Amino acid sequence: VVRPSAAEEARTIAASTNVGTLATLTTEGDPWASFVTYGLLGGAPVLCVSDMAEHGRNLAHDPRASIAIVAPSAESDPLASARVTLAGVAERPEGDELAAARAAHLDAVAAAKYYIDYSDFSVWVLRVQRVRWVGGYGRMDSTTGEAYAAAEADPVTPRAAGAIAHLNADHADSLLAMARNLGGYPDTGEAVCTGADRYGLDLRVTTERGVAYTRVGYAAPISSFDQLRAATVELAQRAKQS
Amino acid sequence: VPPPLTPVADVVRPSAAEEARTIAASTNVGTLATLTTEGDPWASFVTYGLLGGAPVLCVSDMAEHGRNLAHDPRASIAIVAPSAESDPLASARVTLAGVAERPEGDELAAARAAHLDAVAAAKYYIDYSDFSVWVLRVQRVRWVGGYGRMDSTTGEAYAAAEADPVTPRAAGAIAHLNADHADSLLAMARNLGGYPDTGEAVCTGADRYGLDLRVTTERGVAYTRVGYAAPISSFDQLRAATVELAQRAKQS
Numbered sequence: 457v458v459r460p461s462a463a464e465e466a467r468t469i470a471a472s473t474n475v476g477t478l479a480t481l482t483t484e485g486d487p488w489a490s491f492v493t494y495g496l497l498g499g500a501p502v503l504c505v506s507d508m509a510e511h512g513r514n515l516a517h518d519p520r521a522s523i524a525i526v527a528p529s530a531e532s533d534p535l536a537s538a539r540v541t542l543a544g545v546a547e548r549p550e551g552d553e554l555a556a557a558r559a560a561h562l563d564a565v566a567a568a569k570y571y572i573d574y575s576d577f578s579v580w581v582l583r584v585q586r587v588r589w590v591g592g593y594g595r596m597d598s599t600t601g602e603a604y605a606a607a608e609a610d611p612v613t614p615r616a617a618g619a620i621a622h623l624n625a626d627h628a629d630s631l632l633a634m635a636r637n638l639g640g641y642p643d644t645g646e647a648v649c650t651g652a653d654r655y656g657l658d659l660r661v662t663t664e665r666g667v668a669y670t671r672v673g674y675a676a677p678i679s680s681f682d683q684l685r686a687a688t689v690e691l692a693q694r695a696k697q698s
Numbered sequence: 699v700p701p702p703l704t705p706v707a708d709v710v711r712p713s714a715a716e717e718a719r720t721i722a723a724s725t726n727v728g729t730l731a732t733l734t735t736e737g738d739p740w741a742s743f744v745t746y747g748l749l750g751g752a753p754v755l756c757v758s759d760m761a762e763h764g765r766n767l768a769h770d771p772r773a774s775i776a777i778v779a780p781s782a783e784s785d786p787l788a789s790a791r792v793t794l795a796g797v798a799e800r801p802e803g804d805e806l807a808a809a810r811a812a813h814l815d816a817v818a819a820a821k822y823y824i825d826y827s828d829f830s831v832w833v834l835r836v837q838r839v840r841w842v843g844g845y846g847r848m849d850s851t852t853g854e855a856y857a858a859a860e861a862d863p864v865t866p867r868a869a870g871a872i873a874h875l876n877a878d879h880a881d882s883l884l885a886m887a888r889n890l891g892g893y894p895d896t897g898e899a900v901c902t903g904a905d906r907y908g909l910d911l912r913v914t915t916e917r918g919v920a921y922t923r924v925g926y927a928a929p930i931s932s933f934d935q936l937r938a939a940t941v942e943l944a945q946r947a948k949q950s
């Protein structure tokens with residue numbers, strides 16, 4: 457059963473918020489961290505920067521930039537956060553791309569309304585070349601920029617916590633059937649869902665030796681959160697027919 | 699923005715250095731900027747404690763940013779104060795920039811403690827040789843207080859200042875003032891804040907020198923500030939300092 461790729465995780469974190477921190481170079485080559493807001497143009501952060509802000513000047517002088525993005529978290533342990541560095545090169549777009557970048561920024565950051573059309577604020581789009589993902593504790597990987605651009609953000613992740621808890625609170629019995637008949641543990645006595653994404657559900661199952669982890673895939677990947685309902689109903693039905 | 703109807707004696711306001719120190723102390727997460735070994739700017743999520751204003755990091759020697767620091771110890775960190783406001787541009791933020799150094803001896807032990815106190819899970823990493831303690835020697839500061847003021851400061855000014863003991867812990871107090879002391883806030887606006895024509899007053903900030911008030915006046919919405927009778931230095935002193943404010947407001 458397929459799992460989101462690092463590229464997908466990265467896209468998903470990017471799409472989870474509109475704030476991060478840009479790293480740029482001063483003219484002397486010192487590393488400069490700046491708070492920034494952004495929208496996305498197919499996975500690409502779109503910044504609206506004042507030309508006299510330190511980071512606007514940095515980009516104009518050396519357009520190498522990276523942005524670290526942190527997914528909003530329920531967990532109060534910061535080290536459990538899901539986070540990503542998108543690194544490459546920022547460029548001021550033109551023409552059609554500029555108009556689309558502008559729009560994407562505007563609908564992700566309402567207040568940019570008041571800045572984006574002054575001639576002394578510029579729109580930058582970060583051409584992502586490299587990606588480093590850290591998915592909380594002990595999950596990490598790198599990807600290429602092309603893999604990142606090819607991937608899609610997960611439409612289930614943003615509302616997964618609620619879905620997960622609802623499944624555990626009200627569907628423990630269906631979760632158990634899935635584990636027994638689809639997940640490879642016919643004798644487990646208890647199954648808890650520990651994650652949901654567009655490909656399937658992760659299950660923690662009781663064994664005589666502790667717990668095991670299995671995964672059950674939907675009939676096929678889903679494309680919106682509203683399809684999760686039908687996907688779990690089909691999972692429960694397929695489990696009874698085994 | 700309508701002006702005060704009457705003059706008020708200037709109220710002490712935290713300095714940019716103090717604001718910067720206060721933002722730093724408001725949380726234990728930020729983002730480090732370092733140089734890769736090929737000179738690219740690298741942004742990393744990090745956790746930190748403070749040693750007299752100085753971020754203390756605990757970094758894996760095999761993490762990209764650990765390897766960056768070992769090679770070139772120039773670093774900066776951006777820190778964003780936790781906010782109620784959902785408009786990110788209203789956020790208070792700061793960049794602390796300088797040079798990171800692995801401390802030794804007494805300083806290392808104090809750095810270690812400070813990091814541990816601020817980040818519970820660092821418990822499981824900080825004594826292992828794979829992880830190093832770094833302290834950021836702050837040389838310059840850029841502060842952006844929301845839509846409000848912005849300014850730069852020197853590292854010495856930053857080191858000399860103190861974090862506000864009230865502001866980071868004021869959310870409950872602020873809300874209690876707004877929910878239960880509308881009358882007192884109103885009287886302060888009218889009699890001490892320069893806006894006798896205030897009809898409603900809301901406290902939008904509290905710090906160790908005084909309270910910021912947003913006022914609904916017959917002429918529209920305005921902003922003022924009222925100062926304690928003297929600065930305070932601990933949160934438990936806030937109640938008594940706001941009571942004296944209310945009393946001074948009734949006495950004209």
Ligand SMILES: [Mg+2]
Nearest residue numbers: 575576577578
């Ligand atoms: Mg321009």
Ligand code: NI
Nearest residue numbers: 622623626627
């Ligand atoms: Ni249900």
Ligand code: NI
Nearest residue numbers: 874875878879
């Ligand atoms: Ni009170």
